[PDB]
């Protein structure tokens, strides 16, 4: 640690969680594809209001195929993470070529929804799989590559 600090553990904890490598992969229960056509009205009953507050009518497309992402309420406690910070590092990756929604930490079910966008060989589907692939092993959330389990020894 910096000479300015010494036995301030709270300092060290920060540094721990600013260094340790964390991939989207390490926080994923299950990835899945769906045919959701009506953008405003989703076919899934688990996501009523998301989807109910987003407040997209402040401006104010489209995309056919959807890709869901269940997250583990478990590793949102150990590694320091919020839904938002996740979503942002996602969009920040592709840029302005895919819509991305999500819920709040307060909710019981943590979820992500994504939809390709928007050029102008159909077969649009196979590739969408190589986005959910790139999405897992290649997406950094916080910290430096090559680093793994980081220990707080005195």
């Amino acid at each position: 640690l910096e000479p300015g600090h010494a036995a301030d553990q709270e300092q060290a904890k920060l540094i721990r969680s600013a260094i340790e490598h964390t991939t989207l992969k390490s926080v994923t229960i299950a990835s899945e594809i769906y045919y959701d056509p009506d953008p405003r009205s989703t076919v899934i009953p688990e996501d009523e209001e998301i989807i109910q507050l987003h407040f997209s009518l402040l401006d104010e497309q489209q995309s056919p195929w959807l890709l869901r992402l269940e997250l583990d309420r478990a590793a949102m406690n150990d590694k320091d993470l919020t839904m938002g910070q996740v979503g942002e590092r996602i969009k920040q990756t592709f840029k302005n070529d895919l819509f991305v929604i999500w819920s709040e930490d307060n909710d019981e079910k943590l979820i992500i929804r994504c939809r390709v966008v928007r050029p102008k060989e159909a077969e649009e589907d196979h590739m969408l799989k190589k986005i959910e692939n790139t999405m897992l092993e290649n997406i950094t959330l916080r910290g430096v590559e090559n680093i793994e389990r980081v220990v707080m020894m005195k």
């Binding site: 992969k25 190589k130 692939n133 897992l136 092993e137």
Partner: protein, 196 residues
């Protein structure tokens, strides 16, 4: 009781965890490259998808198993027929075009002898070797999903001891056949002579 024909077969699983598309192939005796499994089954006697999967997966409930096999099928839509299911298994020579109907009869007996020489080695057996080749696959995957352990190599029940008997055997057998072809080579040199 058929000498010592050590004809070794391996079923491999290409690509690592999280790779693009993990395809399954196999090593066959007297053949250059590896061969997608779906081609092997068609080259046996089973043609349609979904019937192929019934030799491999046994419980049509547990999907992940099934979802493992999409890559293979989608690799075999190029060969759908009995006949040329063995056309792909014909890279033995550099365009043995002279054998368009003979390379098949080269492949046809290769799955009589070199492919699982136990079980049987006669003609009228194909569903015997399919259920097995399709049981190696149930194992190779029943492990890649991590539902059962890898196989231990230093287990004492999976090794034998070549005693004085069978030692002499694999010797005497080799001796006798040497002397047997010392007779032939002597006979071609009679009549020729009488002889006696």
């Amino acid at each position: 009781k058929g000498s010592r024909f050590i004809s070794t077969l391996q079923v491999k699983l290409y690509g690592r965890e999280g790779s693009s598309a993990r395809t399954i192939k196999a090593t066959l005796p007297y053949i250059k490259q590896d061969i997608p499994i779906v081609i092997i089954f068609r080259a046996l006697g089973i043609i349609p998808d979904g019937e192929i999967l019934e030799h491999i997966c046994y419980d049509v409930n547990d999907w992940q198993m099934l979802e493992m096999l999409k890559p293979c099928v989608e690799d075999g839509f190029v060969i759908q027929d009995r006949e040329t299911a063995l056309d792909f298994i014909g890279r033995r020579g550099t365009a043995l075009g002279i054998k368009k109907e003979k390379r098949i009869q080269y492949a046809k007996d290769i799955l009589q002898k070199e492919f699982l020489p136990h079980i049987t080695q006669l003609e009228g057996f194909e569903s015997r070797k399919a259920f097995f080749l399709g049981y190696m696959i149930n194992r190779l995957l029943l492990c890649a999903l991590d539902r059962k352990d890898q196989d231990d190599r230093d287990h004492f029940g999976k090794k034998r001891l070549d005693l004085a008997g069978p030692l002499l055997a694999q010797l005497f057998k080799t001796l006798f056949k040497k002397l047997t072809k010392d007779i032939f080579r002597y006979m071609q040199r009679t009549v020729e002579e009488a002889h006696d």
